[PDB]
Amino acid sequence: MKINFSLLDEPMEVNLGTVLVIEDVSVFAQLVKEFYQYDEQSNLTIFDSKIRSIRSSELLLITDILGYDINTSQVLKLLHTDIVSQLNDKPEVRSEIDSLVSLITDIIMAECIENELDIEYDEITLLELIKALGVRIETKSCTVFEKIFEILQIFKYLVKKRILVFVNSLSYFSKDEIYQILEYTKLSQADVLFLEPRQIEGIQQFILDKDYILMPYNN
């Protein structure tokens, strides 16, 4: 996952988490505007190992952390499927749940037989039980750090998003929280690209000087 712009000499590769610091406010604002307008503008080009350019639908742009909606139909559906798989991995728990559902179905079936009208039903499944329970992620009481962590956790659930990008999101988190975000990103394998006007101390990042020189920085 390499990204390239006219200011860079060679296309820079983005693997796991990547912190890109732009010291020039003009090039930073122009780069962010090229991030929002990416489908319209040909200046900023992001391509994969196949050199194929990714569509704006495949690109995930995030600026406001608390304003973004983490709960979607596809995210909640795939999450319910993941919970159903977790319950399916254990035979004993699945057997017990099947027993309880069998009892409830017996009770409701008796209540249906007591009625005068002829009634028919099918089954009460686990996905229908999770949908009836209303399982969803809670962003209401979550701190910004837990919100970004939940976004990194649900990025694997999003199928269509090729790369996640954050705009000036590193100013809220402490250095230790940034270390936890990067260390978790290395395990999640997702491609995250952070854009900050000022450099963060203690973390590896790519610095773009006002001279338009891109250099790697350990601190």
Quick one: which of 12, 59, 87, 207 contacts its own copies (CB under 8 A)?
Answer: 87
**What single string gives the DSSP state of each residue in 167-212?**
ES-TTTS-HHHHHHHHHHHHHH---EEEEESSPPTTS-EEEE-TT-
Closer CB to its own copies, 53 or 219, in the complex: 53
Alpha carbon separation from 207 to 38, 58, 218, 219 (Å, rounded):
22, 26, 10, 10
Stretch that binds its own copies, among 3-11, 142-150, 200-208, 211-219 (CB under 8 A): 142-150
Closer CB to its own copies, 74 or 143, in the complex: 143
Closer CB to Ca ion, 29 or 135, in the complex: 135
Separation CA 54–CA 46 (nearest Å): 6
CA diameter of the chain: 85
Contact flag: residue 174 with its own copies (CB under 8 A): yes
* Closest approach of Ca ion to the CB of residue 122, in Å: 5
Quick one: which of 16, 43, 48, 145 contacts its own copies (CB under 8 A)?
Answer: 145
Let me know: does 161 contact 59? Beta carbons within 8 Å: yes
Stretch that binds its own copies, among 2-10, 12-20, 86-94, 209-217 (CB under 8 A): 86-94
Contact flag: residue 8 with its own copies (CB under 8 A): no
Q: Is there a binding annotation on residue 13?
A: no
Let me know: does 182 contact 17? Beta carbons within 8 Å: yes
Q: CB within 8 A of 152, min separation 6: which ones? A: 164, 181, 184, 185, 188, 190, 192
Residue 182 binding result from Ca ion, its own copies, none, given CB thresholds of 5 to 8 Å by partner type: none
Separation CA 75–CA 5 (nearest Å): 32
Sketch the per residue contact string, 12 through 41, with its own copies: x for CB under 8 A, - otherwise: -------------xx-xxx-xx--xx--x-
Contact flag: residue 10 with its own copies (CB under 8 A): no
Q: Is there a binding annotation on residue 123?
A: no
Quick one: which of 6, 72, 77, 144 contacts its own copies (CB under 8 A)?
Answer: 144
- Binding positions for Ca(2+) are 138, 150
